[PDB]
Design a protein around this nucleic acid. Structure first.
Length: 77
DNA sequence: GATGAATCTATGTAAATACTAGTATTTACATAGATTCATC
């Protein structure tokens, strides 16, 4: 429950450094990933998305449809 | 094979926590596509 403190720390594009490091761990983490582990990570992620799609408002739904409609249509290039 | 929706995912980073108030690492979730599927 010691989280609450961290929320506070906010900073001057040292925040750039932090992200660059977050993205460095991630990359590395995925390179160590076994094929079983990756399937399991994607299986959760597809589960989370199915949820979020089941709970979308009609406003969310339509913005998603409009967006994809525009994207698919635009990819005739 | 044209079109549009359902489903899945590469990418990014908030949030939480492990580890020794602060730093370091890991987990959970969220964006914005990219791909698969349904239908005509």
């Amino acid at each position: 429950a010691y989280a609450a403190q961290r929320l506070a720390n906010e900073s001057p594009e040292q925040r750039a450094t932090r992200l660059k490091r977050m993205s460095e761990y991630a990359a590395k983490r995925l390179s160590s990933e076994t094929r079983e582990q990756r399937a399991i990570r994607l299986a959760r992620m597809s589960a989370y998305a199915a949820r979020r799609l089941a709970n979308e408002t009609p406003a969310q739904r339509q913005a998603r449809l409009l967006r994809m409609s525009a994207y698919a249509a635009k990819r005739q290039a």
